[PDB]
Amino acid sequence: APSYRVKRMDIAKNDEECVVNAANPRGLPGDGVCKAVYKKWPESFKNSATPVGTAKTVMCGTYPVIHAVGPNFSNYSESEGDRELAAAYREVAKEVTRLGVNSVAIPLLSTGVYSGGKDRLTQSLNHLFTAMDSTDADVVIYCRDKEWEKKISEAIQMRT
Amino acid sequence: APSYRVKRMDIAKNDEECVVNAANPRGLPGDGVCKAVYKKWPESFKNSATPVGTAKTVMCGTYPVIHAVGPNFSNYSESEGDRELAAAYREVAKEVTRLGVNSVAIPLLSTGVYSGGKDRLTQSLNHLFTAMDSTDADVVIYCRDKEWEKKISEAIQMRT
Amino acid sequence: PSYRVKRMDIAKNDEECVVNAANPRGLPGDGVCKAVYKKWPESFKNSATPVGTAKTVMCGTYPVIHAVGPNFSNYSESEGDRELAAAYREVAKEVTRLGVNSVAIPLLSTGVYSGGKDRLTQSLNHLFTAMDSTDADVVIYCRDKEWEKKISEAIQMRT
Amino acid sequence: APSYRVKRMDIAKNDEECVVNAANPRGLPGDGVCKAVYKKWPESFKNSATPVGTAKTVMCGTYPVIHAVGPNFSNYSESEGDRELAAAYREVAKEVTRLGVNSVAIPLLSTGVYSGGKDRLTQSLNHLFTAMDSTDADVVIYCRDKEWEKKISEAIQMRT
Ligand SMILES: CC(C)Cc1cc(C(=O)O)[nH]c(=O)n1
Ligand SMILES: CC(C)Cc1cc(C(=O)O)[nH]c(=O)n1
Ligand SMILES: CC(C)Cc1cc(C(=O)O)[nH]c(=O)n1
Ligand SMILES: CC(C)Cc1cc(C(=O)O)[nH]c(=O)n1
C-alpha cells in the first residue's frame, strides 16, 4: 500500500530509505538542497554529473542518493523547461524502482534557485506525482516552508 | 541514594514518575516501544515533533512523556550518530531535571529498528550513564530480551 | 570570616576540612571529585546526596563535605542559580556544625557542570553569601592562573 | 571479507567505525587532516600527545580517534624516517585490533607537510598495507588529490 507524505525539515535529516538530490548538470556541490546533501553525503558526488532532465544514483555505503537534474528556468523557456522537468522526475521513479527500495525522500525540483523567480510548487509537484504514481515506494516530500507544507498536504489529500 | 535498575517488561506499565519514549522526529505512532507508548499515552503525541538529538516533553494529564529522538544508524554515520545519541540522552537528563521528578523509565535509544543492524547495547548504555550520572533521579531501564537484561544488569553492578 | 585563594590541588589542602565538588550519586567522577576520591576514598561511603545539598562523611576524623552543585547542562539558569545557592548554604551549615577553624573549598558548578559558561562570578558570589554566615577561614582552590587573579580581586573589593 | 578502498574526500566525514588522525607528537590541533579532525572531534585531543612512530587512541564519546604520528622527513634521515613511518602504521594496526572495530578511516601518513618535499605515496601506502594486512577491518584510505586517488586505487586493485 504505497502512500504520499510531506514533512517540513532539512531533507538531509530524513528517516526514509534513500534521498533524491536536486543536482546541477556538472555534479558540483552547489546550494539549496544540494548543499545539505553534499554536507551529509559528500561521497555521493563522485561521478554524479548527468545531463539536464536525467537522474543518476551513487551509493554512499548503504544509503542510495539519486542526483536528479531539473532545468534552470533562467536557461530554459517555459515550454522546453516543462519537458526537462517531467524527464527528470521520470528517471527518479525509475531509480526508485530499478534499484528497488521501499521509501524515498524527494525535494521539489526546479523550485528554488532554478525557479527563475516563479512559484513552481504546483508545476513541480504535478510532475512528481505523474512520474512516481507507477512506483511501489512510500514517497515523502521535503521543504523549508509551512505554507508549502499545507498546500502540498491539501494536494495529497484531495487525490486520495 | 539515586540508583540504576533494569526491568524486563513493557515500559508502558512502568512504576516511575515519568517515561522516555523512543520517539521519531515526526512524533508519529511508529512501532514496538513507540507504539505501546502511543497506546498508553496517546495525547502526549500532540505537537511532539522534535529533531534528532533532542528531547521534548508533552504531558498526558499530568504524567510527563519525554519524547527522545535518537539517530537512525541506517541514515547516520558512526561518527555523526554517536554525537546525536549523546545529545539525545543529554536532553533526556535536561527534561527529567526540568520536571523535578524523583524517577524516570527509559529505553535504550537507537537499539532496535534505529540500530542499523548493529548491537548497540554498550554504546547506548554508556551514553545513558554519562548523561544521567549528573542527575539525582532513580533510573529504571526497560528492555525486552532476557540476555540484554543480564548484560545491562552486569554493567550497572560494575560501576558501584 | 577570612578569604584566601591558592592555585594547587585541593587534595593537598592545609585546612581543617575539605569541600568536595560532588555528583548526586556519590560516584568517584572526574576532576576535583577524583582527586578527593584518591586522597579520601572512605569518605565516599554513602556520600550520595541530592543536588543543592551537602553531606559530611568522615575520613578518619577529617571531614569531607560532599557538596552537589547543579549541572547547568540539566538545569535552567533560574533553577540552577537557586540550587547553587542551596549547595553553598548547606556547606556553611556543616562548617558551622563541625566547628572547624578552616575549610578548603572549590568553585561549585564551574567546570564540567558549567554548561559551557563562565560561572566564576556566579559561583563565588553564592560562596561569599553563604560562607559569610560562618567565622571560619575560607581557602578557595583553583588550577587556572586567570581564575586565581579574578578570585583575588573579588576578595579584596569586599574587605 | 575485508577490503581496501580509497575515497577522495575530507576524512572528518568518514563512514567508518573509527578514524586515524595524522598527528604531531605534541598532541596539538595542527593543520590539514589534523585541523578537520580537531573541528569534528575536539575532545579526542585531551592528552593525545604520543611520540613519533607511535599511535594513541582517545575516545570522543564512543567514537575512537587514533592519533598516529608519522615522522617529519625534514627532521629524519631516509632510513630512520622509513623505520618510524612503518612503526606508526604497526601501532595503528594494534589499536584497530584492540578496539575490535569492523572498519577504519586512514590517511597516508608523512605525505604532506611531513613529506620533506618528496612524493611518498608508494612508501607510505606500502607501510599501511604491511601493518593492516594482519587485521580483520575494512580499510578506507582518504586523500584529497585526484591523481593520488587513481594511483592508490590502482595499487589496491593489482594486489587482488
Ligand atoms: C545545486 C542546485 C542549484 C541544483 C538544483 C536546484 C533546484 C531547485 O531550485 O530546487 N532544482 C534542481 O533540479 N537542481
Ligand atoms: C518509532 C521508533 C522507530 C523511533 C526510535 C527507535 C529507537 C530504537 O531503535 O530503540 N530509538 C529511538 O530513539 N527512536
Ligand atoms: C564529579 C563532578 C562532575 C561533580 C561536580 C563538578 C562541579 C564543577 O563543575 O566544578 N561542581 C559540582 O558541584 N560537582
Ligand atoms: C599536524 C600534522 C602536521 C601532523 C602529520 C602530518 C602528516 C602528513 O604530512 O601527512 N603525517 C603525520 O603523520 N602527521
Author numbering:
A (entry chain B), B (entry chain C), D (entry chain A): 1 to 160
C (entry chain D): 2 to 160
Quote the paper.
The nsP3 has a highly conserved macrodomain across species at the N-terminus, a central zinc-binding domain, and a C-terminal hypervariable domain (HVD). Recent work has demonstrated that CHIKV nsP3 macrodomain (nsP3MD) possesses mono(ADP-ribose) (MAR) hydrolase activity, which specifically removes the MAR moiety from aspartate and glutamate residues but not from lysine residues in substrate proteins. Mutants affecting MAR hydrolase activity and ADP-ribose binding slow viral replication in mammalian cells and reduce CHIKV virulence in mice. These results suggest that the nsP3 macrodomain is critical for CHIKV replication and may be a pharmaceutical target for anti-CHIKV drug discovery.
Of the 40 fragments that were soaked in nsP3MD crystals, one fragment, 6-isobutyl-2-oxo-pyrimidine-4-carboxylate (SRI-40582), was found in the ADP-ribose binding pocket. In the co-crystal structure, SRI-40582 forms a π-π interaction, a hydrophobic interaction and a very extensive hydrogen-bonding network with nsP3MD as shown in Fig 3A. The pyrimidine ring of SRI-40582 forms a π-π interaction with the phenol group of Y114. The iso-butyl group of SRI-40582 contributes to the hydrophobic interaction with the phenol ring of Y114 and the side chain of V113. The NH group at the 1-position of pyrimidine ring forms a hydrogen bond with the main chain amide group of A23. The oxo group at the 2-position of the pyrimidine ring makes a hydrogen bond with the main chain amide group of G70. The nitrogen at the 3-position of the pyrimidine ring makes a hydrogen bond with the main chain amide group of S110. The carbonyl group of carboxylic acid at the 4-position of SRI-40582 makes a hydrogen bond with the main chain amide group from G112 and Y114, while a water molecule bridges the hydrogen bond interaction between the hydroxyl group of carboxylic acid and carbonyl group from L108. Compared to the co-crystal structure of nsP3MD-ADP-ribose, 2-pyrimidone-4-carboxylic acid of SRI-40582 partially overlaps with the beta phosphate group of ADP and the iso-butyl group of SRI-40582 partially occupies the position of distal ribose of ADP-ribose. This suggests that SRI-40582 could interfere with ADP-ribose binding to nsP3 in the cell.
